[PDB]
């Protein structure tokens, strides 16, 4: 299975999950507070593990890029933390955000002189270290994709403990406040101004569908602010749309490079033929966020984050996602299909990635990068087959017409998995979090062999076959 | 194993879990609203099962009592729903509740003239129907215990949804408002004034400890109001303590009979000897509600609810309840001890009950009744052993000095199990909730033979032995 | 579901599995020798458990009978051990057995004087003791059915240790020897001559198909002589066909009662439509033993021993019995259908019994008794559903034209389960094999209700429904 | 963990499991007939899988050597099939074997002339073909260890079907006949004479303890001749001892090289400290075969075959190997230790290897080579941990004084696992038995990296830690 010469291989990281781990890198944010909160800990909503025991990429990036480069990686999608760049309020510095009568952003203008006013109060030293990190990779002749937002927010933008104690109207409320969007636009233009020379492609945000569904409706996920409200989920979704559209406009002001989004795509499957039509409809509404963006002329590429599926059957009653399939499988065990599931209980289901890319291609006709794909698997029991099977799924989607430009694994190294803490290990490379030492997993050797030759060689082709892993 | 000739055998019920099922029985309350809320259903915090589809005891009590009487039961503990009796506010009817400067209730007066003012605003017809229920049982010549509180509150006392959305300072807030205690005292007086003729013993409230820990801390439990706050948990506990003292004084005003509380008593075990003293301290802390009441002389008997244990060992390196033991076992599986667990994941541990009763006997030296003991077990796979072996544990505690007057199984029939809906079946008697028909389970036959001879006879004695049920 | 007034309820026993356990009741036989053999034990072929530590029914029959009677039973099917009655060889006593040119027995004659030559050689004490046991049940006014052969042979007929060591041509080779048939004929006559006044129906033998299949083909079963040979399996089958023919004629010479056989009938199911025709054929081949007998006019009734099913599917097609179903389920767990499996790994499948009974009714049009039905279930987890759902099955088959005269559960008490020893517990009543005390299981109380009332009453009707037991 | 510059890495193979697969290579043997037998098949004693569908190393050795050499392997232990070399009896070719009074072989002499006589009835073409296979390896400059016996015997030496059907006194009885030892001696001398120039060290035989224990006692393993007898086991063992002595004496006549044996070594553990001593005696009894060889001065080296352990505990009065540990664990699952188990049910237990090597060093003081070590793992879930942890175990044992000259994995490729057929897959390389194509498993990559550097490098050190693999 040969990939095109220019097909990119590598990995993705986020600031909150990778940066911290050694003194010097700690930063405040809504997620930092959420995860140190004693009541969140005691009610078991977050694990009690702390991100400042993480992999310390803010300090060891040079060493981690050495690993990546030696596994034949030529692309990394990285992060920049709004909470770092602007640790104080930006409200006082005004910009032009234009809206239609239904409140869609129609144009934005952060002029150069306003940029210059933001520097006065940004943490310029943080900004410089980001340059160092990104330079260190660009200098090796490689591609860098920059994603502007990967969940945490400045504390002055979102106080999730107070939104939860007091109600969103009595606290700084993040995506629930129309103003956050404007402030984010400032941030997007300020990053695009200083950083364009280091960046090949932009993403405005990562998985916004997770931020609004988990923060405001799926409460046992342990996402901030854990404030259960349909109306809030909808508000937040509406405001992320504007954050994307505004960030897109803001970026194109200071860069001519392509700008997309990175979005969490479950693949939805019906248990049997009779629910095909309903599942098709769940799918239109689950991808809806992206559809909206495409129809507004605001996506140059789409980053596909794919991990697993959901299977739908009737219970009573209604059309429901079924336990024992896809994301609802038994942790560290087997789906009802016989496929292994990850340590996270996510079924290994590469054919969902293939179905997904045919669907997205025909849906939107856009250049796509796989921006996340990987599995929680501490012992590296299944990750070799995951990796090869998902790569063979990308390849096959390409033969049927999908425009896929690279494959970015989640992830190079183990890291802090949000409300689960450190127990979910997603790395090609194990990290002992006490010593910060890195170790290769055999999947890294498989990755090295495939990426360096730009193909799944015969001798490794059998790792796409899932027969022996499935009962 | 012979019991004393006055040892009672019977069962417990609550209003919310049993009364409804058939037209005419429905009634608004904080739980009614909680369990119907669309957002609580999507977030999977509640089952989506509805109490109006329940066993219909409100209509069907006569046949249920017929059943119980032929099981040889001679004592029943039942409830009475504040929200039913007072579905409109009682704030305006002034009463006299005196306090310490510390906020302790030191005396209560609800005089005859006030009782009568309260009648004008009470559902006097609802009251009459409770007389008919208790009376159909009392008239057969049996014992009846009335428990005044079993969790739901009038909507005008507690709006759980507004508390969660707005914060408890901006809505009627249940146990967080001091005023609720005072209204509760009016209610208690109202009940003892009108129903003393039909009640042999009183309990002021059932598992207050679950009310405040599930509601304010253990959010995964799905309890109203789902508002995370240690302070709120502490304040509700504080207030429930007053509710008990106030209600006790109020009952003594119109009645000379015994008054106690019914409490949830998990048994706490150390995984190993090194944890012994910490566990002794966890136990002291967990039972303190009762201890405070006893030291204040406000308990005439204690209602012991026992289902399983919790086992503690070290984590990181914290002391915590360990997955795989007691309440935290696999649903329908086995605990790490080999013992089976219920459909609810509760390890079968009759030795916790024998221990519990020695401990309580020694701590408080009061008459006790097992006011709840049972298992979620749809198929009656385990319930026969569950019953005889906890009955034998009771017998051993009594051989050792425990003053136990009675054993009341939870429950006679399957019923609505709060946030879990109907999937958790506790009945000796299966209920078809569609048809409302009752069918016996073999453990019913076991109960019948034991209660009618007031002994575990030889021929049934091996059912106390868990060897064959343990892996 | 009401049964006809004359439909019999009871149980079955065999001599090897029940008689021994107290000093004085031990007898040599091929099975005795087989299960005591040190190499058989060391090789894990037999359990190590010895049947002289069994329930001691030879001494304790009167108590077992009181239990039986008090459970509402009115019929017992019992055994007589050839190895007890004729402990020394009977070869030299001459009898007239006439055969076909094909070696079918055409007529038999054991004259009176030959019966008296047998008396000199027989253990007449043991005969009389069998009389004390049968009479004790008969004097109660109940029905007794006597089955002449239930597996063990005299050692002078079968030395399974020498067969295996030396080959069947150099040892006394049990059913591999045509002389064994002749000597069985003399036993049958001798028993009909003496015992006809105590017997209501006869069965010549119990599950002969298990004898030849397990002894000579399925070594993993642990059956003597454990000599792998299709040719021996075929020859053993053929000589047991004649054993039954010879025994029927020998019984009829001294009795006018119905003579039948008792056979192990697994129900065969196709996993899918496409194998139906082929499974139909499996079933004809599997029941051929009974078919042959019916077509020679040698069967007055049929005893149905039913426990579970086999499901057939392709595997290198090649139709094989599938693991995860019927007799091939997980011990103590769940079949792939979701049904619970017995301690023995036998899927609970009452529908197989209903199917079987219609099939046999149609094939043979003879009266049938269920001479075994039951499960290994040391804890009585499932036996109550097993019992009620299978009785419901029987009743359904009767509603449909099946001439069923009674239901004999396997069995009243736990007993020695052959190569498995005591670990498979089939009783309605538990036996402590140390003390020999009997204790009732809740399934006994369920049996007592149904049998005394001659009907599955509404209150227990839900025990036929397996929904709550199935995953 | 650095290994000494001359410490060898590679693998082992046996003729029966590897050679056949492509037309031209099939040979008759007791094992060939055993595994083709219809009754062994339908009995489920053997898998029904056939060796002539195996990896076809007889034709494809060259490609497999290429894979080996590129994995950095420098040593191979291989087989020569007696059944190939001498397909017709050698009884008539007289030889001089001198014995003790107690029957021990005292000396051996096969003169040149007799060697020439033997050539004339040997299949010399098969001899030249084995020369081709070994020489293809030797010419690469690598070490080759030739093992004379790896279970199949020529049919004129052993007809196992006939031994079972008739008893060993009436058939060619393999190791039950004294004469087989004499014939093996002729074979030993003949191979030494011809092949010494291709061989660096000799083994007389592989796992004799398995040959006689599985063949004559543990019938469930399905090994020929399936004849249960303690005294046949003791006979075969005695002859196998003489066989080694004679083969050693024969080889030494025609070679100056080291001669040893390859032995199956289970590590034996007490469950608790009280069984320490008994388990110690168990060890010494199980290894007696090797103690005897050494005390007779006929071991220049020991080949250690190590896979796993057996744990011992009380059952009734006596010590048994306990289910759920070591060789007795759940297939595909986990042992009760929390360690993962192979697809054969074998617990991952590297500690056993470390322990064993110190024990063997101390008992015998001999150069050892790990000649087999590996795991059935069709998906490579656990082999990278298996490999690295057992190699670390060796290294620690060498650190403490064990004289170990190399590690040979079982195996390079998937092959035919005896009674289990192909379902047990032990390769670093997967073989598709239909197309004969080879494919690397990720553990082959790990092996390559280790052997070529002759060290366990830092980046792979974590594969030795079994923490993440264990529950």
XYZ file of C-alpha atoms in Angstrom, chain C residues 37-40 42-46 49 163-170 217-220 227-231 316 330 420 423, chain D residues 37-40 42-45 49 163-170 217-220 226-232 315-316 330:
62
model
C -8.204 -46.895 39.780
C -5.080 -44.913 40.681
C -4.137 -44.163 37.101
C -7.613 -43.052 36.191
C -3.811 -39.378 38.291
C -4.803 -38.787 34.644
C -7.741 -36.492 35.669
C -10.084 -38.821 33.801
C -12.248 -39.447 36.956
C -14.415 -38.857 44.598
C -9.832 -54.190 28.426
C -7.837 -50.991 28.228
C -4.534 -52.688 29.190
C -4.837 -55.779 27.046
C -7.558 -55.038 24.469
C -11.154 -56.266 24.529
C -10.237 -59.593 23.017
C -8.198 -60.591 26.134
C -15.478 -42.856 21.351
C -15.546 -39.798 23.655
C -12.565 -40.551 25.911
C -12.682 -37.029 27.454
C -11.011 -47.761 24.710
C -11.094 -45.611 21.492
C -12.727 -47.565 18.651
C -15.646 -46.898 16.289
C -15.946 -50.621 15.652
C -14.614 -26.210 7.363
C -19.460 -22.462 29.823
C -17.404 -35.912 37.735
C -19.258 -31.638 42.235
C -6.357 -41.146 12.530
C -10.117 -40.665 12.032
C -10.927 -41.731 15.544
C -8.289 -39.531 17.145
C -13.637 -37.374 15.914
C -12.660 -38.126 19.465
C -11.264 -34.458 19.552
C -7.979 -35.866 20.921
C -5.175 -30.089 11.392
C -0.196 -50.302 20.738
C -3.512 -48.721 21.847
C -5.870 -51.198 20.232
C -3.940 -54.350 21.199
C -1.488 -53.395 23.950
C 2.262 -52.809 23.677
C 3.252 -56.477 23.939
C 1.505 -56.999 20.602
C -0.275 -40.863 31.704
C -1.744 -37.495 30.775
C -4.100 -38.828 28.093
C -5.920 -35.465 27.681
C -2.546 -42.733 24.384
C -1.945 -45.864 26.459
C -2.611 -45.211 30.144
C -0.039 -47.028 32.306
C 2.373 -45.873 35.081
C 4.606 -48.790 34.480
C 4.789 -48.011 30.713
C -6.519 -30.213 47.823
C -7.965 -32.439 50.530
C -7.235 -19.623 31.182
